[PDB]
Amino acid sequence: STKYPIVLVHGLAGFNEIVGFPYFYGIADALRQDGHQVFTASLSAFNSNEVRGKQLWQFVQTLLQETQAKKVNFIGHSQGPLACRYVAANYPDSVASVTSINGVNHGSEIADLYRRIMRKDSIPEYIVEKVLNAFGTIISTFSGDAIAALESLTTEQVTEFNNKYPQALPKTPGGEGDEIVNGVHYYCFGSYIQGLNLLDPTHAAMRVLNTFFTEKQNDGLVGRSSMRLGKLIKDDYAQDHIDMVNQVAGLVGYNEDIVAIYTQHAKYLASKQL
Structure with a gap:
């Protein structure tokens, strides 16, 4: 058991109520089994x-x-x-x-594009349609207006955030930041879409979005390098953005035990006297 309680943090206050299960699918449940307060x-x-x-x-x-x-x-x-x-x-x-874990620590290229689409910024019709259809499929899958969530995740907005809160950010793109700043430990995990599964309709959509990034290694929403903060644990999981929280309802890539990433990390934290 960790010395300090674990707080799982995500955006989308209405997720559990609208979707019918937690954002971090099965995660808190597995962590508590291991004796941590979550x-x-x-x-x-x-x-x-x-x-x-x-x-x-x-x-x-x-x-x-x-x-x-x-x-x-x-x-x-x-x-x-x-x-x-x-x-x-x-x-x-x-x-x-x-x-x-796949944090938008340096901005989302997809959020950038979405902003150009909204501003009618000379985006060809065929691209507008691919992006909006992919976002529709993702939302539909969970649920049954998304610029609102992406507004704060553009490169411009996150660059401004980073200016105010520069702690633990890497000094070189795709590098690592300091493990300890102001006595706080910082760790990062990430992933990027790999390989050429099929039961989660969100994966095909994330793969559409993946093609629009200049950063080739990305999870559909964030480039691999943008995810970096503090000490790298592992970031080469062959998983999209949604996979990394064990969504949709445990349908992930390549039979990876996503829950195990969290429970192993909790033991790691406990080993660090946290």
């Missing part, structure tokens, strides 16, 4: 990273009061790691670690 912070997707950061800090304050723990271990995905980074930067004595 909580989930589901943050507001349709606003800025700083707003999510503030929301997360309010969450953490209440949780520290309820647990009498002095710090938390953050495990964030996608939007999550940026909110985690805001909390660690402003309140480092309350944060034991930030673990980023």
Whole structure:
């Protein structure tokens, strides 16, 4: 068991209610089996990273009061790691670690393109259609207006965030950042789509989106290098953005045990006196 409780962090506050299961599919359940105290912070997707950061800090304050723990271990995905980074930067004595899993730490090329599409910025018709259809398929699969979530994840917006909260970012593109800054440990995981499975309709869509990145190694939403923060654990999983949280409902790539990435990392944290 970790010394400090684990807080799983993601954007999309309404996910569990709208979809009918957790964003981190089966993750909290497996972590608790291993004896860790686990909580989930589901943050507001349709606003800025700083707003999510503030929301997360309010969450953490209440949780520290309820647990009498002095710090938390953050495990964030996608939007999550940026909110985690805001909390660690402003309140480092309350944060034991930030673990980023496919975090949008340097911006999303797909969010960039989506913004050009919205601004009618000379995007050819055929590209507009491919991008929107892929996003439709992804949302439809979960559910049964997405610029709102991507607005805060463009390269321009995340560059501005990084300017304010530069802690643990790599000094060279695709490199590693410092493992410890202001006494907080930072770790990253990532993945990129590989190979030429079929039961998750989101994978085909993520592969459409993958083709529009200048960074060839990407998970459909974020380039491999953009994911980097602090010490690299592993980032060559053959998985898309959604696979890395064990979605949709456990349908992942290549029989990879996605849940095991999290439970092994929890033991790693415990080994670091976290």
